[PDB]
């Protein structure tokens, strides 16, 4: 009783070609499940990571290029904009002819780039101050330097917005890089050379005189500034407790508890905060409430700042925006990035311009692009089947609450509470197809010119930032999706207490109404449990049914969670990762994702078990000597057939909240008794340790 459908033939062939049945599943299940993929595939030059998951994202791009590249008479305005933005984006000759000019037009208006100016002090240092300068970059261009102010949702009341202050992101991927030795040396060297190179082009294009030594002089000074700011930022592992993280102040407290002396002042938080909010005609009292994520960093900032010029400061501040612009300029500007992105990413070339451009438009017009994607590529009934799967898996989670010995009764009850309260977002929002007005109106204020890509993307930064800040006194809309449809991913929002599964992830190998349920439950089913479980991981457990940051745990149950979850900190902490040169994974920074994998997979199996009990076994797949319990786990693993470039592995072992795909397979299956029953694994086989972690 082999299935011999078209769709069964496709499924089986993919499973076969990926796997290496030469390998004992119980010795190394990633090798087993993925061995044939590993043999046949080399990472593309434009890829920092490649794998089945990334391939889906490459395939989604092909769809986007098809729906963006050809004007259609009936196209509503919203989509004409997307396509026009697309067209402005793929015209390189237009862009190459403008050189850097579009940036030079731009410089004066963020207070300059001193290293690339004459008499910066005469021109600006007058007008200059750090209030005014940090605030420009932030409110006009959304670039967050020195101090990150951001209108956001309020962790303690999910219907409101607040102003946040947090530590900024850095020009290198993580604070660790600023060690600048060993595995980090090239990066630091490439980074400053890239500074240097960009500032030389501008001086040249300005026809200014070029003194290499002073360039190095000033760009090294920028680096040692950023080094200090790096050392002053808190680690991820010390940022992971949302109750620790949430400290609400008035500007008043802030001004009196977190003083800064920049240049010679010192710093007017009130002034700073109004230069930003001013940008949207809103008024801020020194009595305004602010959520402060990074108190210690602010503290630490004081002595640092007092030590550098306005020139030094602005040289870092402007470069952190310029950084991001130069690949939207001509080829010579493009080129100066070459060695820096190689150092961070290991890639030797830019991705295709049409793909970059397809993704950028998706980024900036996600509902419009998403309408098109769904029309071309998304069936419409996938989404009913997924709705029902989500009901199944949510029920299973609830069930398991009874068999979990490390919570107390009341705590279980609240856990069921919060779970009943999860609200699910599947595929796309019908609005974006049925309601033309609403889609046109989201982009009303935008007007693109097909020969001015750089103007266009400037405008999108302004619009974006205008939008966000004006939410301050507005409620949160509970209609709002937190992802477009044309995205290969899924999401949990603890503020919305909501799970989202875009059209883009609802395809093989994760999902098809035509593929075997075993494949479904091991793919998208595992994914739905992942997302649910995040509501109850080491961040999400802190948020309640309404998305509010408030404790609903007993001290005992909370402490047991920490204890149970500690097992995963150690297990994963202990993997060493060849591609990153033998470093251990960070067990703390991945914990949330690892909890979500182990809970999510177990949930999904039990939901497959529950399915088979009710509907009976499935017909087997042709060409494969495996039953469906076995297939369930095959497919789980094959989602993550993939590899990394060493450079990116070094980047990602610090920056990714996920474990690398291979250790996710191995991580979770070692903790799963079901798996080892599937493949008759000996006690103490590599895949089957006697000691096993469990939380959800
Ligand atoms: S946090 C959502 C999760 C969704 C997911 C869970 C389980 C299996 C596949 C995807 C996920 N998205 C990713 C994006 N990049 C790398 C790893 C990722 N993991
Ligand atoms: C590229 O942009 C320039 C604008 O100067 C235009 O003349 C040229 O025809 C454009 N090419 C395409 C294919 O649209
Ligand atoms: C902020 O303070 C500066 C100091 O020069 C002042 O010029 C500016 O008008 C002030 N703006 C706001 C929003 O208070
Ligand atoms: C490996 O597990 C052991 C035993 O708990 C633990 O002491 C050690 O810290 C773990 N390794 C890492 C790097 O976390
Ligand atoms: Zn996740």
Curated annotation (Swiss-Prot):
Regulation (activators, inhibitors): Inhibited in a dose dependent manner by opiorphin. Activated by K49-P1-20, a twenty-residue synthetic peptide shortened from the snake B.asper myotoxin II.
PROSITE patterns: NEPRILYSIN (PS51885), ZINC_PROTEASE (PS00142)
Domain Peptidase M13: 2-696
Positions bound to Zn(2+): 530, 534, 593
Residue numbers annotated as active site: 531, 597 (proton donor)
Record bears the keyword Repressor: no
InterPro entries tied to this protein: MetalloPept_cat_dom_sf, Peptidase_M13, Peptidase_M13_C, Peptidase_M13_dom_2, Peptidase_M13_N
Family: Belongs to the peptidase M13 family.
Protein name listed in UniProt: Neprilysin
Organism: Homo sapiens
